[PDB]
Design a binder for this molecule. Structure first.
Ligand SMILES: [Cu+2]
Length: 229
């Protein structure tokens, strides 16, 4: 249970919920065919469009609730340690990131932090150690203009049952300057890109000793592979 609620651009804090379409509650989305998969549950919307340069170091901040820890010494801030899973970031080109409908967009993945089998480290593990932040560079080649920036935590602690994987998503409204001429060869739909039966969604991550180490096996994140310039 956590909410993507803040963006940083090359270390510059943009402010809580500034430029975000984020849910009001930290409850997970579990139906991969729901419209809630696009930007999380409908909650707060911002009029701000975050100005970014292609290649910038983007930070995405998860916290247990809106504003940080739910209470002093909250053990589930930024997110419960049991919630092992990947973190993924997608882009969708839109004309107007402040007014565009989240429905029917053409998404492509730009980054993911999934699972390292030799270190037994999940993307969520890195999120926790970075105090809720996940860091990734916008591709140098993406074209100028407005995008929705979709960041997604997929918690797999009870994903061994159908439809029980937990998704925590929000969208950031951005405008890219100094970009290139990249257009994705292929795009995916949200909802639609994920299926409940995907090997990275319907999965038992627990090993011999009951640890969430995926039995040291490689993990296949759902959706397309990250694009390359
Ligand atoms: Cu949770």
């Amino acid at each position: 249970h956590a909410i993507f609620q803040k963006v940083s651009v090359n270390g510059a804090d943009q402010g809580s919920l500034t430029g975000l379409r984020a849910p009001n509650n930290n409850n997970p989305v579990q139906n991969v065919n729901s419209q809630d998969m696009i930007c999380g549950q409908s909650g707060s919307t911002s009029n701000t469009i975050i100005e970014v340069k292609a290649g910038d170091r983007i930070g995405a901040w998860y916290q247990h609730v809106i504003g940080g820890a739910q209470f002093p010494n909250d053990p589930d801030n930024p997110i419960a340690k049991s919630h092992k899973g990947p973190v993924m970031a997608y882009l969708a080109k839109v004309d107007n990131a402040a007014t565009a409908s989240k429905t029917g967009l053409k998404w492509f993945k730009i980054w993911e932090d999934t699972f390292n089998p030799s270190t037994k480290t999940w993307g969520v593990d890195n999120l926790i150690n970075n105090n809720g932040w996940v860091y990734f560079n916008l591709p140098q080649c993406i074209a100028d203009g407005n995008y929705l920036l979709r960041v997604e935590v997929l918690a797999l602690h009870s994903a061994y049952s159908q439809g029980q994987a937990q998704f925590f998503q929000s969208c950031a409204q951005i405008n890219v300057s100094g970009g290139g001429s990249f257009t994705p060869a292929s795009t995916v739909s949200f909802p639609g890109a994920y299926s409940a039966s995907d090997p990275g969604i319907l999965i038992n991550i627990y090993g011999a000793t009951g640890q969430p180490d995926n039995n040291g096996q490689p993990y296949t994140a759902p959706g397309p592979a990250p694009i390359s310039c």
